[PDB]
Design a binder for this molecule. Structure first.
Ligand SMILES: C[S@@+](CC[C@H](N)C(=O)[O-])C[C@H]1O[C@@H](n2cnc3c(N)ncnc32)[C@H](O)[C@@H]1O
Ligand SMILES: [Zn+2]
Ligand SMILES: [Zn+2]
Lengths: 115, 298
């Protein structure tokens, strides 16, 4: 047995639930590299930069990060979120994946699958 | 005035030299609010303008800089100020924060519990405190110097702040301490800085710039708090979010300030001069070890 919180949050959202609030949005130039998880805010014209801890579901829910060793990708970092999704940064970080070649979000900046 | 385009306003020196009596603080802009950028928390803007102001001072910024942040949590369960400090301080800076109640942080380490329980082996290059207890704002009773965490802070500064290090301690009209004002005289420079976003509050940050480990000038904390309240009573500050829109020069410049482990007999006037200019930090460069005392009971 293991509590599956990502699933429960996705179903909570699908049920019309209010997304997690108080994600810490940073002030920045919005001329950054647009990569997904960075050491300082890197939002571009189309993103907002948040403090990573406030955008991680496990950190925010006080539950174990789901991996051996229990490490957290977001805490201590900054996560860029497309402004069209900035209402729900935790749901965004849960629902999406970062390209390991270029630092960008798959489908939200990554163009490594181009001609 | 250009003041609306600054991150905030610092107490003018002529006010520091007065000898006013303590008066009730009544701000002309009380109840006004700054128009924060969309989606930005007040404390992110406040910490931002604090750091923008700090960029104008002669802070020592070593390699592997050591910053401790008291009062880092909120009723939101997150640490906005810690995130701003993280953004502001150079990469590789050790950031430890703490609060009485639990919160999630981007600091390298977080201690939960009363600040009086916090002990560290090493010394620190920068101390930030936003500790505040709302029960102090009692307009129906005398405004005495307050103890509690302020006592800890004074102790923590005299024992665990590196020479040349700097502090910024949040105070209000009622959340203040006389020994902290006195301790400001042990720095090469000091001020009380009000952010433009929160200029309708008696809040200010007591900033001690470049610690010298001994009194440079003699400061009466009661008189000096009276002077700060007189300043804020007679100088309405115009609420402003302007400085928040130019983050192009926000990061603290990594100066590589020298760190030296000197004994006390070795601190000549030339060393004092280097400390005064933000060009030297005196502390040991060992491992950073922290702890929080836990009281056991049944
Ligand atoms: C104004 S809030 C700080 C908000 C925070 N700086 C932020 O970024 O939003 C003041 C904090 O000081 C804390 N505090 C007050 N007295 C304390 C004490 N004696 N020891 C530790 N924390 C204390 C409170 O728990 C409260 O979270
Ligand atoms: Zn996490
Ligand atoms: Zn890619």
């Amino acid at each position: 047995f293991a509590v599956d919180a990502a699933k429960a949050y996705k179903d909570y959202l699908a049920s019309g639930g209010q997304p997690i609030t108080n994600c810490v949005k940073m002030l920045c130039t919005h001329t950054g590299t647009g990569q997904a998880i960075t050491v300082t805010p890197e939002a571009n014209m189309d993103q907002e930069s948040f403090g990573g801890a406030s955008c991680c579901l496990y950190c925010r829910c006080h539950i174990d990060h789901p991996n051996p060793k229990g490490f957290c990708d977001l805490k201590g970092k900054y996560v860029q979120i497309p402004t069209t999704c900035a209402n729900d940064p935790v749901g965004f970080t849960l629902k999406n994946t970062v390209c390991t070649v270029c630092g960008m979000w798959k489908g939200y900046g990554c163009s490594c699958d181009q001609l | 005035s250009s003041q609306a385009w600054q991150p905030g306003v610092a107490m003018p020196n002529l006010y520091k030299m007065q000898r006013m009596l303590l008066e009730k603080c009544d701000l002309q802009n009380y109840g006004d609010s700054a128009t924060l950028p969309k989606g930005i928390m007040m404390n992110v803007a406040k910490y931002t303008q604090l750091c923008q102001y700090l960029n104008t001072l002669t802070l020592a910024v070593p390699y592997n800089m050591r910053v401790i942040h008291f009062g880092a949590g909120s009723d939101k369960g997150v640490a906005p100020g810690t995130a701003v400090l993280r953004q502001w301080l150079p990469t590789g800076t050790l950031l430890v924060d703490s609060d009485l109640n639990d919160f999630v942080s981007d600091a390298d380490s977080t201690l939960i519990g009363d600040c009086a329980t916090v002990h560290t082996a090493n010394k620190w290059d920068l101390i930030i405190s936003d500790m505040y207890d709302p029960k102090t704002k009692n307009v129906t009773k005398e405004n005495d110097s307050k103890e509690g965490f302020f006592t800890y802070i004074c102790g923590f500064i005299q024992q665990k702040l590196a020479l040349g290090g700097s502090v910024a301690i949040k105070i209000t009209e009622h959340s203040w301490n006389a020994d902290l004002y006195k301790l400001m005289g042990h720095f090469a420079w000091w001020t009380a800085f009000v952010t433009n976003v929160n200029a309708s509050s008696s809040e200010a940050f007591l900033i001690g710039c470049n610690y010298l480990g001994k009194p440079r000038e003699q400061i009466d904390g009661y008189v000096m708090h009276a002077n700060y309240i007189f300043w804020r009573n007679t100088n309405p500050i115009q609420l402003s979010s302007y400085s928040l829109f130019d983050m192009s020069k926000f990061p603290l410049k990594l100066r590589g300030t020298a760190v030296m482990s000197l004994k006390e007999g070795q601190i000549n006037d030339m060393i004092l001069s280097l400390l005064s200019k933000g060009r030297l930090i005196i502390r040991e460069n060992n491992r950073v070890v922290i702890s929080s005392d836990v009281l056991v009971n049944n």
